[PDB]
Amino acid sequence: GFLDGKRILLTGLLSNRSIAYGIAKACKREGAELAFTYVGDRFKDRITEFAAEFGSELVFPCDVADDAQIDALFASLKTHWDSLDGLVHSIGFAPREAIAGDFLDGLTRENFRIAHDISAYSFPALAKAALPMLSDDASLLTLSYLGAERAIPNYNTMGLAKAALEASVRYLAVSLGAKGVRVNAISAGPIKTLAASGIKSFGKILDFVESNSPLKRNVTIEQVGNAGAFLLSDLASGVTAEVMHVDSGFNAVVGGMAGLE
Amino acid sequence: GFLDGKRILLTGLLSNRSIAYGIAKACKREGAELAFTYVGDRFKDRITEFAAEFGSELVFPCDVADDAQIDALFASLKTHWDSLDGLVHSIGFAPREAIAGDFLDGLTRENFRIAHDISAYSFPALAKAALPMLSDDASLLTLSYLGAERAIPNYNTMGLAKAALEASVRYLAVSLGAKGVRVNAISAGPIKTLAASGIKSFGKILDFVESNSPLKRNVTIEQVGNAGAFLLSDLASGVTAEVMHVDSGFNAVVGGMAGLE
Amino acid sequence: GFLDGKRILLTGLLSNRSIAYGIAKACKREGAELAFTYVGDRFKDRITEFAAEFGSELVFPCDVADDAQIDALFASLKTHWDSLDGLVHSIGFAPREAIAGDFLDGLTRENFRIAHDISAYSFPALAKAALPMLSDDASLLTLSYLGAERAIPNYNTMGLAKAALEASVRYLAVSLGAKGVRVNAISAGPIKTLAASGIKSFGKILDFVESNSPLKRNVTIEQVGNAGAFLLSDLASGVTAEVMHVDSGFNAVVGGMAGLE
Amino acid sequence: GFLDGKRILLTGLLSNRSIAYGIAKACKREGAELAFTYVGDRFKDRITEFAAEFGSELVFPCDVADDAQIDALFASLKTHWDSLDGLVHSIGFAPREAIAGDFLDGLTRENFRIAHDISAYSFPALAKAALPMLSDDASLLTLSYLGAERAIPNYNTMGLAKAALEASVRYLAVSLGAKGVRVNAISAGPIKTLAASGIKSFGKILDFVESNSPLKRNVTIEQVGNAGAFLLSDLASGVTAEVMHVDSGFNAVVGGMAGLE
Numbered sequence A, B, C, D: 001g002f003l004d005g006k007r008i009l010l011t012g013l014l015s016n017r018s019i020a021y022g023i024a025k026a027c028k029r030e031g032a033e034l035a036f037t038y039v040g041d042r043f044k045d046r047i048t049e050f051a052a053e054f055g056s057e058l059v060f061p062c063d064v065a066d067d068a069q070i071d072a073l074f075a076s077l078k079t080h081w082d083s084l085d086g087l088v089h090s091i092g093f094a095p096r097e098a099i100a101g102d103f104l105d106g107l108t109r110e111n112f113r114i115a116h117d118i119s120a121y122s123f124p125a126l127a128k129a130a131l132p133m134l135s136d137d138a139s140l141l142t143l144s145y146l147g148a149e150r151a152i153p154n155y156n157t158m159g160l161a162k163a164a165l166e167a168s169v170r171y172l173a174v175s176l177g178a179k180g181v182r183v184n185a186i187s188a189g190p191i192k193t194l195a196a197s198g199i200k201s202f203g204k205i206l207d208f209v210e211s212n213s214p215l216k217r218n219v220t221i222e223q224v225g226n227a228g229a230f231l232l233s234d235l236a237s238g239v240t241a242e243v244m245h246v247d248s249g250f251n252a253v254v255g256g257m258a259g260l261e
């Protein structure tokens, strides 16, 4: 397909319901060669299997809290791939209390720190670490959420982190653009994933979106994935510094103002 | 490719440098069946040829100033196509003085009217007229410009018109979304086209973008086209009500603040 | 107060519940000298009284559909005021069907035209007509609504018109800024006014905002008015081309995603 | 004036050119009672003097890196003021290399951390710490910059930090709004201040803004201050979760596309 020959590294493939699984599946379909990261030796087995069902045996540990692992990841990858065409950043984290209840109740310096460190800093950090082996027409993708633009209940500290994440997309696009590398994000709609379990009221959000988005339907990892593959391909070569919504248009409306119909 | 079987109507193919030419070329490449509109019997010959080099003999007059022609277009098309999968709105107009010099000097009620009528109203108007023969997973595309979001010199009345155009994308996405039809826009960067001749300082804008966009390069009708084809395809089924920038990221920076280096 | 000596013309004072009434009241309070417009000889009596309770006897007919009345308004005003410090644009209109039910059902070329003509074009048109007697530090205010930014049910064609209105703010700010005149808008929240009667589901919107805005309360013409007076004063001299929300922060959240609590 | 009786705490008054100095001066003028913070015992003398020229003897150390000082600040203030009506957050920091040259060259985990910790986290942290003594109609103000919205040369890591700062405004507005407290920001234009010295190319930016903003002029701490006082007053009671530009409209244009005139 439109990603033949492209070599792409995917982070954040945790289960068969992960957004990164859908992106991987679309990229593979379009002819990319894939490689994967995992967090912690315990998960090496599960990820090696995932990579195998995508025709890949390239897996590398990367806890983004750890500078050593970030540098090692790309030293390791470089032994297998001379150059890297795509990077998918599809990871994040915030302590329970930082994404539950009131925004201030759950706010601490450490909660703020961790959330921004893992969910925002890790993207340009991965970009920097990958730069030497990035090809000139490389493309970097990250995943964001509407909670960066507007206040969403329980999203809280992540919203702050995502807004910084979206800003890093713009600074990264400038910093890497002379060379030719593009940098974008997808602002995905609610998808039932493992991470989604940390958002109490996710089911409520999910229902609301289904009811109120222009398409009257929620998105899938296939849809987010197909847009992933697009942004990562040369079809999207005129596109950088862009936060693309894949949320059935939910971002663009003001919904739920029917009154107990 | 990813538009096999899709039947798509393109407006605004005036020359081999038109944005609509690039979109057509990408769609054809991806396996779409195409049909075209032209303005005025004089141009029937030139467009019939364009359609022929895309493997199509379906051409239909449509001056969007004229309700009769809008209704006739889709009565005519319906005799050849049972259903319509894609509509490309790539047209517009504003009187010379409305896009030259000071915004107020060139402002008149008629200039305002014409500009909005042709450049903004015609999109949902085409959408409405096409609705009966639109398939459920149809996709409608229009072209906008950064002048809708921020004041650009000489763009003037068009900026107002484009902002209304971008709003119509959102209302159209809601209005047609229950049925399943998606509605989006591409905010394209400066491209040397016939319409571009109406913008004095286009060459200056073109230079500035090349110099200051993250990618340090201007876009092409191929790049805008590839993103067209994407939005029009099922790869973009999670995407509606979206204004997608295809401008090498220019929208996202504040450029040219080097001082006589 | 902070508008002493300022001479300000207000449009759109229809009743004691009009947004323009609140703006007038705040400006008067802050020491402005006021003048008013009315639509149609029938309403001359009601407006002359309103002006009297603001200490003013300056009233002038202005149907913004009519170029003659726009030019006459400022010829007339010029006989009483040597110079103009403030202009409040607080007017608009769209045919019933254009702001009811589905966006496409109510869409016609004439409905589009009228809506944009009265609600959007009239602002820069008033600005142009007023320019000769505008003082260098003059300030122009218009009123918009969140329906310009995001699709709101029933708002429909007005949303398109408001988006053009908000764009005209930016082009006007550039066009009049060298001279020193500022141009801004207030994106007001839902307020029970005569115009509000044209929006079926206004009560529903009103309830939703009260329930879901950060302040858990709706705004008043006093609040919109106080922000009016601010923007019109020299306190706001660093501010132009700005769309300021006065809506208890409603614009900035994603509300109502509680599920049948 | 319009802040009589209000008791307001100001952070970030470092010199007579600080933005916080201008805000203080406007608030005092409008009848507020003021109190100030300073960083480090060395600066106690300079700030005690500043407070004295505003009729205040209330000064309190607060290095926002330090949880102990944040809690102590409001224990101390509470001994003098029963309740707090206003808080001005006008502080920040990023290591030299984090705001110089390329965005990636200067990027480190620690640089990211410090920048976000001091420039973004400290605002809601101050809000939380102040909450018990905040009155119901209290108002909190922070200062941001256009670098949060679009990539600006050399702004780099601060841009990320400011975007998180602006998001915290929205989450804080929701979290504190039921009680009635408002939370806003001013996105100020370039002003020659001590902090400005950390931005090489500040003079270039300053020149560009003067040349290209709609008002053809830069802003002052008086202008930012007057808008401060506004947001902090009951005139702005309909306004929360708002990022208000005070930058002569620079944000709203695309400037400098004249070509070597």
Ligand SMILES: NC(=O)c1ccc[n+]([C@@H]2O[C@H](COP(=O)([O-])OP(=O)(O)OC[C@H]3O[C@@H](n4cnc5c(N)ncnc54)[C@H](O)[C@@H]3O)[C@@H](O)[C@H]2O)c1
Binding pocket: A011, A012, A013, A014, A015, A017, A018, A019, A020, A039, A062, A063, A064, A065, A089, A090, A091, A092, A093, A118, A143, A144, A145, A146, A187, A188, A189, A190, A191, A192, A193, A194, A195, A196
């Ligand atoms: N699911 C949604 O509704 C939704 C919507 C919009 C955006 N997103 C975003 O998409 C991305 C993926 O999340 P998801 O929905 O696929 O759920 P997920 O749980 O499947 O993926 C989360 C990933 O975060 C990774 N991760 C956590 N801490 C890490 C660390 N220290 N180092 C490396 N990786 C770490 C996990 O390993 C996991 O793969 C996230 O950035 C998330 O914010 C999700």
Ligand SMILES: NC(=O)c1ccc[n+]([C@@H]2O[C@H](COP(=O)([O-])OP(=O)(O)OC[C@H]3O[C@@H](n4cnc5c(N)ncnc54)[C@H](O)[C@@H]3O)[C@@H](O)[C@H]2O)c1
Binding pocket: B011, B012, B013, B014, B015, B017, B018, B019, B020, B039, B062, B063, B064, B065, B089, B090, B091, B092, B093, B118, B143, B144, B145, B146, B187, B188, B189, B190, B191, B192, B193, B194, B195, B196
């Ligand atoms: N070229 C650029 O720099 C640029 C950038 C962003 C957006 N756009 C937009 O892309 C679209 C296409 O313009 P272009 O750049 O391809 O130049 P173009 O001249 O090739 O296309 C303009 C089209 O407008 C059509 N048109 C004018 N009046 C019409 C009417 N009454 N009825 C039907 N069609 C009419 C013309 O026939 C022509 O096909 C426009 O909407 C334009 O605003 C252009």
Ligand SMILES: NC(=O)c1ccc[n+]([C@@H]2O[C@H](COP(=O)([O-])OP(=O)(O)OC[C@H]3O[C@@H](n4cnc5c(N)ncnc54)[C@H](O)[C@@H]3O)[C@@H](O)[C@H]2O)c1
Binding pocket: C011, C012, C013, C014, C015, C017, C018, C019, C020, C039, C062, C063, C064, C065, C089, C090, C091, C092, C093, C118, C143, C144, C145, C146, C187, C188, C189, C190, C191, C192, C193, C194, C195, C196
């Ligand atoms: N009330 C709300 O909820 C709300 C919210 C946001 C914005 N707005 C806007 O505020 C402005 C004022 O409306 P309102 O709420 O005060 O209701 P309103 O009915 O009191 O004011 C409407 C005004 O429109 C004027 N008008 C209509 N046609 C006109 C014409 N051809 N020429 C001159 N004037 C004409 C009317 O005379 C009337 O004064 C409008 O622009 C409206 O869109 C209202």
Ligand SMILES: NC(=O)c1ccc[n+]([C@@H]2O[C@H](COP(=O)([O-])OP(=O)(O)OC[C@H]3O[C@@H](n4cnc5c(N)ncnc54)[C@H](O)[C@@H]3O)[C@@H](O)[C@H]2O)c1
Binding pocket: D011, D012, D013, D014, D015, D017, D018, D019, D020, D039, D062, D063, D064, D065, D089, D090, D091, D092, D093, D118, D143, D144, D145, D146, D187, D188, D189, D190, D191, D192, D193, D194, D195, D196
């Ligand atoms: N000057 C500009 O061009 C401009 C433009 C937009 C926004 N801003 C913002 O306005 C705010 C004020 O900066 P400024 O322009 O007045 O310059 P400034 O140097 O006068 O103010 C900076 C302040 O940061 C304070 N600060 C630094 N580290 C601190 C810490 N650990 N704890 C407490 N305070 C600390 C300093 O004490 C100083 O008062 C900043 O947030 C800045 O980002 C400035």
Ligand SMILES: CCc1cc(O)c(Oc2ccccc2[N+](=O)[O-])cc1F
Binding pocket: A090, A091, A092, A093, A094, A099, A119, A144, A145, A158, A189, A190, A191, A195, A196, A197, A198, A199, A202, A205
């Ligand atoms: C409500 C939408 C949503 C957004 C996320 O960023 C998301 O992913 C996370 C949520 C909380 C903490 C960390 C993550 N994450 O994987 O980045 C899950 C979701 F369901």
Ligand SMILES: CCc1cc(O)c(Oc2ccccc2[N+](=O)[O-])cc1F
Binding pocket: B090, B091, B092, B093, B094, B099, B119, B144, B145, B158, B189, B190, B191, B195, B196, B197, B198, B199, B202, B205
């Ligand atoms: C500066 C970028 C630009 C934007 C357009 O919308 C554009 O197209 C038009 C310009 C003026 C009037 C009408 C059109 N148009 O074809 O819609 C051409 C351009 F060069």
Ligand SMILES: CCc1cc(O)c(Oc2ccccc2[N+](=O)[O-])cc1F
Binding pocket: C090, C091, C092, C093, C094, C099, C119, C144, C145, C158, C189, C190, C191, C195, C196, C197, C198, C199, C202, C205
């Ligand atoms: C839902 C909020 C709202 C917005 C308006 O612009 C408004 O004013 C109008 C509504 C429809 C047509 C015309 C106007 N108007 O006075 O401009 C009334 C409202 F209640």
Ligand SMILES: CCc1cc(O)c(Oc2ccccc2[N+](=O)[O-])cc1F
Binding pocket: D090, D091, D092, D093, D094, D099, D119, D144, D145, D158, D189, D190, D191, D195, D196, D197, D198, D199, D202, D205
């Ligand atoms: C270019 C405009 C500008 C923005 C700032 O946030 C600014 O303030 C800082 C700049 C760098 C680091 C820290 C600060 N700060 O005081 O928050 C100074 C500026 F000149």
